[PDB]
Design a protein around this motif. Sequence first.
Motif, mmCIF file in Angstrom:
data_model
loop_
_atom_site.group_PDB
_atom_site.id
_atom_site.type_symbol
_atom_site.label_atom_id
_atom_site.label_comp_id
_atom_site.label_asym_id
_atom_site.label_seq_id
_atom_site.Cartn_x
_atom_site.Cartn_y
_atom_site.Cartn_z
ATOM 1 N N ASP A 9 10.233 -63.619 -50.418
ATOM 2 C CA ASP A 9 9.862 -62.155 -49.871
ATOM 3 C C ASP A 9 10.533 -60.959 -50.821
ATOM 4 N N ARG A 10 10.962 -61.891 -52.258
ATOM 5 C CA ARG A 10 11.874 -61.139 -52.696
ATOM 6 C C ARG A 10 11.623 -60.475 -53.961
ATOM 7 N N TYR A 11 9.923 -62.179 -55.099
ATOM 8 C CA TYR A 11 9.876 -61.211 -56.428
ATOM 9 C C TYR A 11 8.863 -60.909 -56.332
ATOM 10 N N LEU A 12 8.166 -60.153 -57.022
ATOM 11 C CA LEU A 12 7.002 -59.248 -57.429
ATOM 12 C C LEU A 12 6.763 -59.521 -58.499
ATOM 13 N N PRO A 13 4.725 -59.271 -58.421
ATOM 14 C CA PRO A 13 4.061 -59.922 -59.570
ATOM 15 C C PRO A 13 4.066 -58.371 -60.512
ATOM 16 N N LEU A 14 3.481 -58.362 -61.666
ATOM 17 C CA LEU A 14 3.053 -57.496 -61.469
ATOM 18 C C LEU A 14 1.210 -56.683 -61.267
ATOM 19 N N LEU A 15 1.245 -55.416 -60.851
ATOM 20 C CA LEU A 15 -0.077 -54.898 -60.663
ATOM 21 C C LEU A 15 -1.148 -55.020 -61.489
ATOM 22 N N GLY A 16 -2.515 -55.081 -61.175
ATOM 23 C CA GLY A 16 -3.353 -54.928 -62.437
ATOM 24 C C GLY A 16 -4.028 -53.678 -61.424
ATOM 25 N N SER A 17 -4.908 -53.440 -62.526
ATOM 26 C CA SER A 17 -6.156 -52.353 -61.603
ATOM 27 C C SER A 17 -6.136 -52.037 -60.855
ATOM 28 N N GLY A 18 -6.025 -51.676 -59.966
ATOM 29 C CA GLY A 18 -6.498 -51.411 -58.388
ATOM 30 C C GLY A 18 -6.296 -52.545 -57.161
ATOM 31 N N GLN A 19 -5.101 -53.047 -57.560
ATOM 32 C CA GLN A 19 -4.061 -54.543 -56.664
ATOM 33 C C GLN A 19 -3.118 -53.682 -56.504
ATOM 34 N N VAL A 20 -2.974 -54.164 -54.875
ATOM 35 C CA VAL A 20 -1.612 -54.128 -54.156
ATOM 36 C C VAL A 20 -1.188 -55.836 -54.080
ATOM 37 N N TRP A 21 -0.003 -55.059 -53.414
ATOM 38 C CA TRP A 21 0.939 -56.110 -53.699
ATOM 39 C C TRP A 21 0.711 -56.817 -51.681
ATOM 40 N N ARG A 22 0.486 -58.169 -51.508
ATOM 41 C CA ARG A 22 -0.069 -58.958 -50.437
ATOM 42 C C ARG A 22 1.120 -60.446 -50.296
ATOM 43 N N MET A 23 1.442 -60.968 -49.511
ATOM 44 C CA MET A 23 2.219 -62.313 -49.291
ATOM 45 C C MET A 23 0.653 -62.717 -48.986
ATOM 46 N N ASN A 24 0.403 -63.940 -49.474
ATOM 47 C CA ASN A 24 -0.560 -64.943 -49.686
ATOM 48 C C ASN A 24 -0.895 -64.859 -48.321
ATOM 49 N N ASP A 25 -1.642 -66.220 -48.302
ATOM 50 C CA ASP A 25 -2.665 -66.799 -46.611
ATOM 51 C C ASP A 25 -1.806 -67.955 -46.320
ATOM 52 N N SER A 26 -0.560 -68.507 -47.411
ATOM 53 C CA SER A 26 -0.139 -69.760 -47.129
ATOM 54 C C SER A 26 1.456 -69.472 -46.682
ATOM 55 N N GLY A 27 1.033 -68.036 -46.833
ATOM 56 C CA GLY A 27 2.869 -67.483 -47.257
ATOM 57 C C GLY A 27 4.300 -68.099 -47.697
ATOM 58 N N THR A 28 3.719 -67.991 -49.054
ATOM 59 C CA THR A 28 4.748 -69.139 -49.481
ATOM 60 C C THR A 28 5.004 -68.065 -50.718
ATOM 61 N N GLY A 29 4.414 -66.412 -51.388
ATOM 62 C CA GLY A 29 4.202 -65.555 -52.066
ATOM 63 C C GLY A 29 3.745 -64.523 -52.271
ATOM 64 N N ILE A 30 4.522 -63.557 -52.676
ATOM 65 C CA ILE A 30 3.696 -62.072 -53.002
ATOM 66 C C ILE A 30 2.835 -62.101 -54.511
ATOM 67 N N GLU A 31 1.705 -61.888 -53.821
ATOM 68 C CA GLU A 31 0.629 -61.791 -55.062
ATOM 69 C C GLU A 31 0.156 -60.653 -54.865
ATOM 70 N N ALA A 32 -0.820 -59.728 -56.381
ATOM 71 C CA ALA A 32 -1.678 -59.008 -56.798
ATOM 72 C C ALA A 32 -2.712 -59.105 -55.844
ATOM 73 N N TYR A 33 -3.170 -58.272 -55.566
ATOM 74 C CA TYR A 33 -4.933 -58.678 -54.454
ATOM 75 C C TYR A 33 -6.004 -57.518 -54.648
ATOM 76 N N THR A 34 -7.278 -57.172 -54.878
ATOM 77 C CA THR A 34 -7.362 -56.417 -55.378
ATOM 78 C C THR A 34 -7.935 -55.674 -54.308
ATOM 79 N N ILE A 35 -8.051 -53.848 -54.505
ATOM 80 C CA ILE A 35 -8.969 -53.426 -53.293
ATOM 81 C C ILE A 35 -9.700 -52.410 -53.859
ATOM 82 N N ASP A 36 -10.918 -52.251 -53.389
ATOM 83 C CA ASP A 36 -11.933 -51.578 -54.090
ATOM 84 C C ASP A 36 -12.703 -50.248 -53.571
ATOM 85 N N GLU A 37 -11.810 -50.583 -52.202
ATOM 86 C CA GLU A 37 -12.631 -49.097 -51.415
ATOM 87 C C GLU A 37 -12.338 -47.684 -51.365
#
Lengths: 817, 817, 172, 172
Positions: free
Chosen positions: D144-172
């Motif tokens: 719950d504590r370590y964040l990844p670097l965000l690429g362009s058009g990305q948000v922080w999102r807990m992964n499907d396994s619930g094991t870490g926060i990963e950068a997730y792309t949104i183009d809406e």
Amino acid sequence: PIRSISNTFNRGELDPTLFARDDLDIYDKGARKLRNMIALWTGAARIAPGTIYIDMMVDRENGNAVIQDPLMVKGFDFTYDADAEITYTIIIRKSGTNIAFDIYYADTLQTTVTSTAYLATQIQDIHVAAAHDRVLILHENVQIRQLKRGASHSSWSLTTFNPRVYPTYDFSVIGEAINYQSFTFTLSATTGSITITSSSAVFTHNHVGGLFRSLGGTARITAVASTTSASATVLDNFTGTSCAGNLSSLAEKLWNSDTTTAPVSANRGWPARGVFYLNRLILGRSLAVKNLVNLSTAGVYDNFDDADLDGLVAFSVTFNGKGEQSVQSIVADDSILFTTANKLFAQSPLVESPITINNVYFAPQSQSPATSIEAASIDNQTLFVSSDRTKVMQAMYSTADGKYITLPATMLSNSIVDYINSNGTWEPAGISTRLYLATQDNGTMLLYSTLQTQNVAGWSLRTTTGKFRQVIGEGRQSHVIVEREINIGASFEQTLDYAYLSDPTFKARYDVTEFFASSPMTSAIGVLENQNDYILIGNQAPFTALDIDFNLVASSDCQLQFEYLDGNGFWDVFTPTDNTSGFTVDGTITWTFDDVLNWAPYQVNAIENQYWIRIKRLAETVNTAPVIGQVLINTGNRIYLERQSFDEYMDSTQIVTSDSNGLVTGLTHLAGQQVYAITEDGATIGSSFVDASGETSVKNVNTTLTVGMQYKPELIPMPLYAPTQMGDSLYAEKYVQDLYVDYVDSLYLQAGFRPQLTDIPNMHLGNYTLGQSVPPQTGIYRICPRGDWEPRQEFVITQSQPGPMTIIGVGYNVEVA
Amino acid sequence: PIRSISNTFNRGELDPTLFARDDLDIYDKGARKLRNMIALWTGAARIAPGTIYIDMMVDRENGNAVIQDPLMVKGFDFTYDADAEITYTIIIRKSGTNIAFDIYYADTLQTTVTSTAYLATQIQDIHVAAAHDRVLILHENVQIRQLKRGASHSSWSLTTFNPRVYPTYDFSVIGEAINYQSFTFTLSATTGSITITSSSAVFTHNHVGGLFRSLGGTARITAVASTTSASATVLDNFTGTSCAGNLSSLAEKLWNSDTTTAPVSANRGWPARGVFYLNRLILGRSLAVKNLVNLSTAGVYDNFDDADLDGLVAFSVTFNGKGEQSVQSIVADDSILFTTANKLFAQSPLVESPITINNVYFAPQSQSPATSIEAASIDNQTLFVSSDRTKVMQAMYSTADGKYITLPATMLSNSIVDYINSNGTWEPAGISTRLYLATQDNGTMLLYSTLQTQNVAGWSLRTTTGKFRQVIGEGRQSHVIVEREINIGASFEQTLDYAYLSDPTFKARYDVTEFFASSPMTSAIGVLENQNDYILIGNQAPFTALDIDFNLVASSDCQLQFEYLDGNGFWDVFTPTDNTSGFTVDGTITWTFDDVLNWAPYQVNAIENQYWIRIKRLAETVNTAPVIGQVLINTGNRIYLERQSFDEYMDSTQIVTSDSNGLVTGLTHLAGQQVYAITEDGATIGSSFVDASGETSVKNVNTTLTVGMQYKPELIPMPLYAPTQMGDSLYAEKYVQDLYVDYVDSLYLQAGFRPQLTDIPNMHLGNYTLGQSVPPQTGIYRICPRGDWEPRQEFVITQSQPGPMTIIGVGYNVEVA
Amino acid sequence: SNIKINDVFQRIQYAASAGQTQFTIPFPFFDNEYVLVWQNGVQLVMGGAPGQYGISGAGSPSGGLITLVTPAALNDIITIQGDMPIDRTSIYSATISNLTGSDLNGDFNREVVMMKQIQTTQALLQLQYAPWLEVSQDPDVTKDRYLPLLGSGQVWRMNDSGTGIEAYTIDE
Amino acid sequence: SNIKINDVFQRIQYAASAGQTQFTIPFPFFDNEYVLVWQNGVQLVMGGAPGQYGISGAGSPSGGLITLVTPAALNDIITIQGDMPIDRTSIYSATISNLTGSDLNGDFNREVVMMKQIQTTQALLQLQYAPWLEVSQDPDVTKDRYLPLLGSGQVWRMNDSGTGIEAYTIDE
């Protein structure tokens, strides 16, 4: 393992920089501290002699104006009849702008002799030359006087010493007169009364009585008509009437204070040092020629005729080395010894010098600068203070070296030496000591017990409730001039010796003595800033009033609480009359000696022997803390003459008698002081305060008593020295299981490791009859001091109340780890 | 086997060739190193006295032209009134091509007296003879002058000393005049004014004032008409008018510089040595007869008439042995001692000699060549520098030997002795020492503490941030003349004291100091040959700029990196302004003191107490490495007069006051130096750099401070000496478990085994009030040094920052394997 | 040691040259165990084996050194960070004892370094609002600052009422 | 340096009145350079020219005052924040024999103000989980504590396994 060691004290107090010198044989023969005691030549330490009050120094010609400047008093002794034990203590003191001589005998003022020839500001520069039956008064700017005693104790005369013939000197030789080497002198005739004429202005009126020598002839000048003409009487015939200036000699009178008679002369001054040696009078260190001494004609002390150059005539000795050699003192030890500004001048005692002109062999013996304090002769040696006054020098002829050898007599005790300002000697009757005494600027007195052939040389330091200003004596007796404080009632003169600010825990120390002592416009300090803060004040003598000036008063009552420190180290509350109403207005704070009944000298944070009071602010809220500009106390300075005695164990003593209520009067010189009382049987019955009127109450009624002030002896032996096989144990952890105190004829002893000491009893239960005084006791007392394990731990031997005290040794059983 | 041993420092620093001499009693009484400290006669070691800045030596008559040649300055002291403590420090300095006398009193320039009679190149050959009230100025080629003080401090006069009658000498006896043994002299008459005629040319104009003796008569020549005719006045009658040349005696004036008046005379010169002894003036070592002294008439210092041969008349003493015996010093000790080029001449002090003609018994006592530095008298002995100036000789009379015995006083301390160029004496007030001081060519000063009767003789070496050039003093006070560097801003004068080239590991040392110091055309060296090479530079004083001239510039930027060495031994990068652009063009490299804030003296490979900077090449590829011709730094030499004092703990100190920001101004004589500040309470508050304008910032604001330069005391005791039963353990493996430092009145101490030392605390937590200065501390501190097992290992007692320091002993617990 | 603590971030990062082994530590440190080293995100260990490193410069103002046993490849990322535990490094007696400036310097310097390590993480590795933004000045107003725990596939999204941040599932 | 440090946030913000020029600094500060001033998100410069400010009150326990040269418009946002460096450049000698109250108070107060600046940032300008949430009490669990670097058009999102926060792309 346990080692048994002992310690005696024939080397006195040793400087702390010697404490690693176990190689020297002085480590078990000295003391860390030897205060208010002396070292007997047997190795024991005896309590220092006490003093008896004689008189208070006053200006008797100006309504007994109290003298409060020590530079206005200077005394000397004069033995008139040794077998009858008649010695006079003469005090030169201020009398208006002039001086007077107060002559004391048998502790009583006999008479006063005034003199207008001297200024009160010249007193410290007046030296004397005591003959067998008269005293010469010497000052470099005033003609010699004679002080001679008449037919009784109270009959004295002060006349002028007039030489039969004056000594002469040629001042042009030192470039202090007209140079006549290029002149020509013409004589009217070679015999009888003649006239001497100079081609240029040379003569002055001081040449009357001078000499002119040339062509094998001598003439004494009898009149000076002008700067180029004079009349003379031929003493030895001249071979011609034309004398070249460079081959002649013209001398004026060596001593002269006349600078106005035409033609005007120079102020040559008069001798300031002198001594009577065998059948001659030696006078030297005049104003104009400080490095010259004159010896009178053999057998005629007042004749200095130097017309002749052979036989028993008067003659001069000039001292020159490398630089200034102004004569400091003339010593009659072996041949004549001359201490000067740089070098000691003397001749070998092995040579056969009859002390005549051209048969004198004085030479520079060693480099040893001396000051103007007169040298002392005692114990087969000469002692004199050095020029910077921080050392005492010892001079002694060494046949192995062929000269007089000078070395510091204070070489092992430099730490206690301040600046020395006077000295004397004393050989007290019945006491195993030869004493050299010397007072210092800081108000203490050095004591030097010496027996040179037996390797006895021990220094100790003497302190009093006051300040020693001079010590007087040549062996037969000893007097001191002491500045003491007295309670002056409703008036204020003196400032507190110590003043501090402290925090509620009473651990902080912020020294504010200078602010309290200074005038309000010089310095001021804010006090009692927070609740429960303190003001700690201390003084060498008791005081019963404060007078406070505020640069800024407190905005509201500080709710002051007052406490005094008693002899047990306990702070006790007392209630004074506070006219400042808690530091809200300028005024006084006064209290009585009954409020401070248990007040006694004590130590607070390494400051010893003061009367302490502390003031505590209890007020919770004050908007503006007070600022103090100056604090004065109700004490004033006085100067006393006191006689030292080994039969006294207190200072400034006086014999009094108590009435049926124990009241004692007539103690005005001790007003405001804490005093002890000693009965005739030799029992100290207790202490009490003398009030401002000179009255006190003692325990014994209808009793004759001796009343005086305590000076507390203290003996701290050298650090434990118990060398084992492992080596010197100078830094090993040590513990003292047993402490042995070896004493002779002592009372009221206590010893041990501070703070908890042990008293040494002096009363035999089961062999004591009530009302009797147990005599001074002899024996050995064994104590477990309960000290620590430090290599340099201190054990103290002291006295609880005044009395006899002699400590002959200290022993230990030491566990050396 | 664990042994406890101790070490005191009564014998000073011992030569390394003595370290196997365990049989001597000095092994535990000396030190391996005693630097910037002295040995007290109690055996303790005290930090050396500091100095107070007085003035900078300038040519005041030529627009204050700064004097930078030490040979152009020579000072001496003159005591005018010992009791008033009036001693003048007179400095003879260059004034154009002539000299001037700068007279100082109370650390202030009183007046200046110029003189054209002397050249600036003769200053070092000018000697003085101080009388009781005047100083004679002596040079072998210039007539005697007299410097006498008038009626105030600022009133002085310099006049010519003119004898009443000149001394005479027959120079033909030494083959320096015409030999008249075959001539015949004819007199016109036997009495009165006569004419003396010679059969051959003998007379010169210098014979005017000379003497002619023959046939029992004496005549004084008054005129010389020609080389064969002269007029004379008969003093003693002749028995005839025909005098054989071989039975006669013709003498001219001993002193004369007139070589032009017909008939022409030789330049006989004037005396160059002198002293005032008792009632005579002794002058000797003239230009023509260097082995002869003249004593004036008894009681007439300026008369040298030697017509008569009996009585109190003036006379001469000639010194001869095997070879040259030119007089070096006339000592007023005992019966006068004469140090010469070869032999010491004196008479036995046991003999009763009145110092008159024909009653003088000077004999060659011992072989001891002496130099022209004046002998010193102190501590019952005479000390003088040997002729080669590598030894100090001590002379004392030994009755067992019947003569004066000379031996090297530097016998045990030969290692620290360089070439000596001056000496003085000092007997400071309140200090247990008698000091003999002597500066050396290398810029250090020797200190000698002596108490001869107590076997106290300890040497020590004094160094400063500069070079000692002279020491002045006769016991009452001590001054030094010191050459120091100051920052001169944008100009460049001095060269680096040290310069090395080093490899990337910074271990190689290639000394290039001479190449950097020399001019570009005399020597040059290539630098920074490879990548990551170094240039290491050091200097005794801080510098803020380099000026570099290249014989061959670098072909491209060397990418220089600059670092400086701080007081912790840490190299720190700083960025200067590099106008050489990486050694590609001639130019300067400058930086500010803020860039080098932590700069402090440090040691690099046995070179101690230098300010170090290193330059590292970072460029990967340069085709042609630079070649440096010369490097200069922005410092210049100055010569100062300073007064030594035992109340100071820094050098060249000055009292200053800081403003509300802590800024301090007026320190121009310390420009560019690192200085420490000490409060009046005696607490050292830190160090800072004075900039080129004489300003620096201190920590305490609105405070009065003393500001000066640190001289670091160092004390290395003797090697461990713990003799066991197996024998002397001089070479056994030893380990020190415990080291005890025994100190008195000290601050800021640190001790142990290098490099990791232990600081000795001087602050009592729980008994300290913030803002107060804890007084100098006394006690014993125990340290585990953690040293090695070597038989000869070094432990150091030193000081972290200036302050009081006295070490009374060092103890050990040694595991002797 | 009595050193001065300079104002330097307690973290440094490099991109290695080909075969580089030595990397400088620009910030002060007091113990070797309190300096962490990463290479491409993998923490290294002190020692002499391949893949390990040596360290020098403890107690020095700056200029420490990290020496890799195995030379780094081109563009390897080396990260050096100070990590010293918060603790008392001194003890003082209640009874009267000795004090030195070395004792005080050691305490204050180590506490300054500890604070700098906290502030280095805050400045370089953590998120914050710009200082000039109009955030609530009362910390009890937690609308903008308190986060919820995120479930699987959820993001932080301010709710439609604008009253707090809540976990929001993205339909993807 | 003989002053108290009160418990006051090291940041203050104001909405200016029309023509207001004087703004109070309620927190202590030791040097003028260690204070940052923003007006509508633009950092100001200390000086006397228009658009600049003057500052007084350094060293005072109760703070000082900011005086704008140009009067502020209505509802201008003024932000004042303390920014003292975290270092120690004045140290004691190895064996001091004089330790002033100002020096001792200075070292303790200086570190308190440093910590208050760090805590003011984390209390007012940073994100955190609520103190009562069930975050892992082992810091090595970084889910719950370590964040990844965000690429362009990305948000922080807990992964499907619930094991870490990963950068997730949104183009809406």
